[PDB]
Amino acid sequence: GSSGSSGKKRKGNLPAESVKILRDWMYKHRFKAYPSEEEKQMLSEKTNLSLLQISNWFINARRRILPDMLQQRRNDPSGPSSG
């Protein structure tokens, strides 16, 4: 037996209650903070978001959350472009 669903909508950030689902995972995997088509699709079921939103959130989230949980002070200023 096989089946599926669809949904197209537009919304800003995600609701904490929902984020928790993503974060909780981003923590254990904080190492890379990059889920797989499977991981995302899985969480999207609990958060009720769209694969697009999932990864999208991780992007900016990995700039405030990842660094907030991992707290890895790399201190490596990527050289400029000068162009």
UniProtKB/Swiss-Prot annotation:
The chain holds residues 51 to 120 of 241 of the full protein. It is found in: Nucleus. It comes from Homo sapiens (Human). Belongs to the TALE/TGIF homeobox family. This is Homeobox protein TGIF2LX. The gene is TGIF2LX. Specifically expressed in adult testis. It comes from the Eukaryota. May have a transcription role in testis. Residues 8-68 bind DNA.
